[PDB]
Structure 1
Amino acid sequence: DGVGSSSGNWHCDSQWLGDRVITTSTRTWALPTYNNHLYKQISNSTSGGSSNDNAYFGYSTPWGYFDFNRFHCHFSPRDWQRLINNNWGFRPKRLNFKLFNIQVKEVTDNNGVKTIANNLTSTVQVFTDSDYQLPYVLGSAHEGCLPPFPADVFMIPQYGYLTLNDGSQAVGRSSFYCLEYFPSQMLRTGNNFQFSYEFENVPFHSSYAHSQSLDRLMNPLIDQYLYYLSKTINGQQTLKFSVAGPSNMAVQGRNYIPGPSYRQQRVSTTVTQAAASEFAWPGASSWALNGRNSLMNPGPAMASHKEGEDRFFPLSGSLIFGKQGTGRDNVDADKVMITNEEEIKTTNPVATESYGQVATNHQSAQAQAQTGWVQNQGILPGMVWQDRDVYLQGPIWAKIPHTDGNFHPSPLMGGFGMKHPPPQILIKNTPVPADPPTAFNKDKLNSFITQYSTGQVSVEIEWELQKENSKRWNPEIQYTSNYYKSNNVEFAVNTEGVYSEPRPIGTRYLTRNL
């Protein structure tokens, strides 16, 4: 429109209908100039790294991008509490995104002092990768998302991507992408940008915990009409059979079995434990691709620990969040928040235990029957399992890789897997050259006016709800704040205005039968 007219209003609210909840969040963003308007080839050689498992090749772009792939970007703690305490499931339906109130500033430095002024004629470029023609980086748990607290002003992360690499070198199959080779809208201070997106059909997330275990689905009062091998010896091959009943539930015939497993090493959170060695990488569970070892993290959805063993967690089978103010490198256990998936112990195997035992020979009068531990078990017919729970500060969705085949493409870090997820939204400040020389020079200009941009961003997502119809008589487990006095209110600001999330919040508090 014009310089003196706002191009949008501040929309931040949650609307709770019967089977739907609509979340709207608005944030103020700041966008600097990245790479000084240049594309730069990057690799482990340019970052000084030399281990082959950490080798890479790719490019850093002068473009930024908008990321809102975390639940706390849309749900307040109270809204999250309502969702998890009142619904058996939820899933995103549609998306509305807006950019408005664009403000481009120029920075001039004379001597140790910088002056900031408006550049009303400068432009900012925005486009969406609706055709998914660029590498998708929103499927990784990267920082730079919209802040959970609406009052926080955030910096737009720089967009970068990786391609095929051989050590620090590239190959002929490696691809180079120029983001200026895409049509993009150019916005001055009076312009705004908006688009709508429809989520593809995805299953409802399981925001419930099973009230029954897979091995306890039988009637505890009635025998089965099936027999099991009880005895074998007299005290001669004396085969004896008995009815499987309530007194021996472990040997009863069952129609379904627990889901797959990929065993994790076990770590205790108890201080004054002596470790026998440094094992964080040597003892790690891991998968190899083209000679590169990657850590299995978080791996298949498995129960974090057995009943009563909350002190143990899988070495890399659980999401680890950092508390507010936590450092980047080598922080203590009390500075991080270790999530656990104990709710899925009713259907999924324990992460730090073998799946089971399998016969490994033919027993005879000369050879005793032998069994072997199954540390990793693939998918078998009749298996049932629960996917990893999602969290308030955890990811929402991920892009299913474009491959010939996949099985249960639920993101392993939690969330909804989609072939066509919300498109990447890329933003960049248009370069503004400084005064050029009065004589023609064919070289590209390298002198630009120092600029940055700021504005507001709004994203609205409609969520579909799956209401609970339980006939359970006794009250359910519910997420609740603790009344006991404390120096600060949980999920609030401190005396210095710092917002903090004191604990990870799952979704599985209500119960339903298996």
Structure 2
Amino acid sequence: DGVGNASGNWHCDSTWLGDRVITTSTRTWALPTYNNHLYKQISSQSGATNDNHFFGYSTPWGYFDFNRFHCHFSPRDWQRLINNNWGFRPRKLRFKLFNIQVKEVTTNDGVTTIANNLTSTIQVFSDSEYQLPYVLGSAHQGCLPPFPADVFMIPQYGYLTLNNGSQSVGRSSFYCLEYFPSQMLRTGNNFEFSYTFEEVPFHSSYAHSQSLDRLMNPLIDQYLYYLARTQSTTGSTRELQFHQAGPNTMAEQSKNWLPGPCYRQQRLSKNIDSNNNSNFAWTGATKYHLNGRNSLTNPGVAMATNKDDEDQFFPINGVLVFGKTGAANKTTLENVLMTSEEEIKTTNPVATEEYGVVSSNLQSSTAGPQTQTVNSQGALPGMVWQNRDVYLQGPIWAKIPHTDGNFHPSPLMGGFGLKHPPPQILIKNTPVPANPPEVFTPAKFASFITQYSTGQVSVEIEWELQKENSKRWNPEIQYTSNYAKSNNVEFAVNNEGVYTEPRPIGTRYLTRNL
């Protein structure tokens, strides 16, 4: 198109069409110049702890990130979804950039003047072949604002490569994004992209109405026998007694399935008075060892946050913790929203409890039986489990690493695991040299006109809906807003125009038989 012709329209809504829902989100974005158009090698400081060493590159490119459910679902749409479906999955994606405006900024005597540069371009391209490092599945900031009215800054792209301490190795890879084909857009140009999600399992948008330890009929006995006593009742000399387990001995009944794998985490009380007086946030945390580096298992394997009547206890680093609006990068428990995974109490072990006890020796007339606690149990035949719940403010998808093998490639932070996820969309402002010297100089250029860009970005996602088909008689639990009077409406703006999300909403409100 031309300067005076709009390259697109604001499409922001949600349409429900039975088994599928299409959400269109339109946002206004601003992209500055990053790194002064330079690729910069970045690494950890000298004083950094060995666990925090890194080596990589920060690039002059920006990237678009919409890997959060609140980018696409409004609170009302999220409530409509979670309250009426047993699951959902992303199906199709359309991406649009339009109404691009490149603006030149000139500073004179501390006065900033912004003018239109009608001939400047922006470079945009999608890494459709996944040849670049993927950073969209790391719960980084810089997403599309939940509120359509808010204007967001496009985050700076960067990546990490193999590092030995603060140094690089011969296998370290440097990527120049200018080596890729790129679409160049002036003010009248727009960019379009389409993507199809791979077949993935539906997210479990339900809780279990039964526990894996209570799948039997509570009226009949079992025809199998279990050893109920190794010693005689009255005269406790010796014997082997076998009983048929029944309703009164539900714990001793034979069963076909086992709770899911465990990786034990330290328990912490929301009431600080009940916590030990020491700094064990790191020394007492649950970690994995990789190439001599300790890394938190945050949030780690999907486990129940707490057991019945223990909502005030949470795993030390096994829960997704969001921040309230206006919360600083560092704050206390009062300014953060802690998710709860208690719905998976039915199948998953509690994050802060043991998996069980196993025999550790052989008993005899002289050696008594001995058991040891299992604080980390891997996959066993007959195991069943649920994944972490997804949240309106949580991530949608994570890229499955390209490895020889994997076990249940479901992201631990939650969401959909994709071998070929939505490709990264990288955007940059084309460097605009300032007036060059009148005599040729081979020196690398370092004088550019300060420029930034603004535009509209549209993301349309089609999700397939799994409709609940329960025969349950009594009313189900639903997500609802509080009818009590309040100073501010929930999920709205305040007197200052700040949009707040007061609590994290999961998806598991409806129930399903185990």
Q: TM-score if structure 1 supplies the norm length?
A: 0.99
Counterparts in 2 of 1:98-497, with a 5 A limit? 98-234=96-232, 235-273=236-274, 275-329=276-330, 331-497=331-497
What's the CA shift for 1:274? 5.0
Amino acid at match of 2:186: R
**Which stretch of structure 1 is more off in the superposition, 335-344 or 272-281?**
272-281
Task: Give the Å deviation of 1:237.
Answer: 3.5
SS of the equivalent of 1:228 reads: strand
User: What is the identity, as a one-letter code, of the residue corresponding to 1:465?
Assistant: L
Query: Could you tell me how far 1:406 is from its partner in structure 2?
Result: 0.3
Note the residue ranges of structure 2 that are not aligned, 5 or more in a row.
none
Partner secondary structure for residue 373 of structure 1: strand
CA–CA distance in structure 2, aligned partners of residues 215 and 273 of structure 1: 31
The answer (yes or no) to whether the contact 2:269–2:275 under 8 Å persists in 1 is no
- Partner Cα distance (1:363, 1:275) in 2: 37
- The answer to whether the 8 A contact 2:65-2:136 is kept is yes
Distance 2:384 2:274 in 1: 36
Query: Alignment partner of 2:294: what SS?
Result: strand
| In 1, Cα distance between equivalents of 2:403 and 2:226 | 45
Query: 1:271 and 1:284, CA in 2 relative to 1: closer, same or farther beyond 3 A?
Result: closer
In structure 2, C-alpha distance between the alignment counterparts of 1:318 and 1:389, rounded to whole Å = 11
Determine if contact 1:213/1:347 at 8 Å carries over to the other structure: yes
Root-mean-square deviation (Å): 0.7
CA distance in 1, matches of 2:190, 2:175: 26
Between the aligned partners of 1:394 and 1:156, the Cα distance in structure 2 is 19
1:405 aligns to what SS in structure 2? coil
Q: Is the 8 A contact 1:42 1:59 kept in 2?
A: yes
SS in structure 1 at match of 2:248: coil
Distance 1:339 1:233 in 2: 47
Q: Structure 1 pair 439/286, CA: closer, same or farther in 2 (3 Å)?
A: same
What stretches of structure 1 of length at least 5 have no aligned partner?
none
CA contact (8 A) 1:37 1:62 kept: yes
Give distance in 1, aligned partners of 2:182 and 2:401: 26
Could you tell me the percent identity over the aligned residues?
Answer: 78
- Counterpart code for 1:70: R
Provide the secondary structure at the position in 1 that maps to 2:273.
Answer: coil
Residue by residue over 1:97-150, the C-alpha shift from the partner in whole angstroms, topping out at 9 and shown as x without a partner, is 000000000001110101100000000000000000000000100000000000
Q: In structure 2, how many angstroms separate the alpha carbons of the residues matched to 1:361 and 1:462?
A: 56
Distance in 1, matches of 2:241 and 2:210, equals 32
Q: What does 1:47-62 align with in structure 2 at a 5 Å threshold?
A: 49-62=47-60
Q: CA deviation at 1:275?
A: 2.0
Contact 1:70 1:396 in 2 (8 A): yes
Distance 1:233 1:50 in 2: 60
Which whole-Å CA distance do the structure 2 matches of 1:257 and 1:194 have between them? Answer: 48
- Distance in 2, matches of 1:393 and 1:479, equals 16
C-alpha distance in 1, partners of 2:400/2:444?
Answer: 39
Which residue of 2 is the match for residue 509 of structure 1? Answer: 509
**Aligned partner of residue 248 in structure 1, secondary structure:** helix
Work out the CA distance in 1 between the residues paired with 2:39 and 2:450. 17
In structure 2, distance between residues paired with 1:7 and 1:199: 27
Distance apart, 1:272 and its partner CA: 3.1
Match of residue 16 from structure 2: 16
Could you tell me which amino acid in structure 2 is paired with residue 150 of structure 1?
P
Map residues 54-93 of structure 1 onto 2, 5 A cutoff. Answer: 54-93=52-91
Query: Which region of structure 1 is more displaced relative to structure 2, 145-154 or 49-58?
Result: 49-58
What secondary structure sits across from 2:353 in the alignment? Answer: coil
In structure 2, do the counterparts of structure 1 residues 143 and 49 end up closer, same or farther at CA, with 3 Å as the change threshold? Answer: farther
Residue 68 of structure 1 aligns with an amino acid whose one-letter code is: F
* Deviation, structure 1 residue 189: 0.1
**CA distance in structure 2 between the partners assigned to 1:248 and 1:339 by the alignment:** 35
C-alpha distance in 2, partners of 1:56/1:167? 7
In structure 2, how many angstroms separate the alpha carbons of the residues matched to 1:226 and 1:288?
44
Contact 1:49–1:55 (CA under 8 A) maintained in structure 2: no
> What SS class does the counterpart of residue 249 from structure 1 fall into?
helix
SS of the residue aligned with 2:120?
coil
Amino acid at match of 2:472: R
Q: Distance in 2 between matches of 1:448 and 1:461?
A: 38
Q: How many residues align?
A: 511
1:360–1:370 contact (8 Å) kept in structure 2: yes
Structure 2 contact 103–116 (Cα < 8 Å) conserved: yes
